[PDB]
């Protein structure tokens with residue numbers, strides 16, 4: 001009873017530390033993780049070390065990584081008090097910076113951006129510690145001949161959001177983030193195209209459904225970060241041109257629709273955006289399919305991620321003054337389900353009977369020099385290291401679940417899975433829940 005949201009927030013940050021690629025800091029808290037992927041580089045040998053490994057693998061997928069950064073920064077901006085109350089403000093900022101420092105490296109030229117390091121097949125064929133990888137790690141990029149409005153746009157949004165986060169604590173860094181954000185948006189807007197049609201390897205892992213929502217999302221964030229009316233005008237012009245008011249609701253690495261709407265509602269105070277947001281939220285609370293125990297069931301993939309993302313949109317809607325009490329309560333029921341109100345915790349390393357076998361390579365490995373290979377994956381025992389803070393895919397439409405390492409549906413973990421979740425936790429702490 002009564003969950004310690006402050007500690008879960010700290011736990012989520014430990015999950016992101018566990019996803020760190022590159023050279024780890026002396027103050028790393030998740031110390032079983034070691035320096036890795038130190039040879040990541042671009043076509044000309046540009047340094048591309050750092051960033052976050054996407055999920056239980058070691059590929060650096062730029063699209064969901066950027067989305068993760070934008071949402072984490074977003075929560076830091078609107079619910080900073082939540083981080084401070086949990087004594088995790090510094091760490092919260094570091095989680096965002098780990099991503100943005102990498103995006104800066106990936107932005108090799110004004111209209112050139114590396115969206116991936118590591119190949120899906122070569123990476124996934126390996127099961128072991130990241131520092132033990134010996135396979136080639138190709139780096140793929142988008143440019144004026146191979147556009148990626150979605151990838152460049154989301155990265156611009158993330159950079160713009162981070163510039164706000166660091167505006168006072170590190171003005172120099174804030175300025176740099178913004179310079180890159182502006183250039184990446186121009187690239188995204190002037191060279192239209194889906195990044196997965198260029199970086200084809202990503203088409204079977206993180207294919208983009210549509211890049212138009214990212215353009216609006218990016219422009220909105222740039223307006224917020226610059227107060228430059230041109231970005232607001234562009235954001236709203238594209239919103240109307242693309243007719244986002246009628247797009248399917250929801251917020252996730254692929255679709256920014258609901259985020260764009262609640263964001264613009266705040267930035268413009270216009271009733272139209274608020275109407276769209278209300279309709280969406282009321283729909284979720286009153287009609288969207290739910291499991292018998294109350295969990296919003298939006299899809300079989302990353303089920304908890306979808307419910308937590310919805311919870312965050314609800315918390316953001318509450319801030320606009322929309323049915324604040326009921327929206328916040330419902331958001332809490334979704335987070336609380338993930339924490340254990342459905343019978344067991346679905347957050348590794350936390351609560352009652354949590355998942356102990358997440359589909360995750362680094363946490364499954366014993367410490368060197370012991371070998372870590374597919375026999376480790378095949379082990380009947382729980383993952384050697386507890387992956388504190390990771391939100392798994394979750395239970396099925398009937399609240400059924402079995403902790404299985406091979407189950408990449410229910411036991412999948414990923415950076416995008418914890419983004420909305422973590423920001424929602426910060427909001428709950430800020431609200432005094």
Ligand SMILES: [Ca+2]
Pocket residue numbers: 150208209210211212213214254255256
């Ligand atoms: Ca999209």
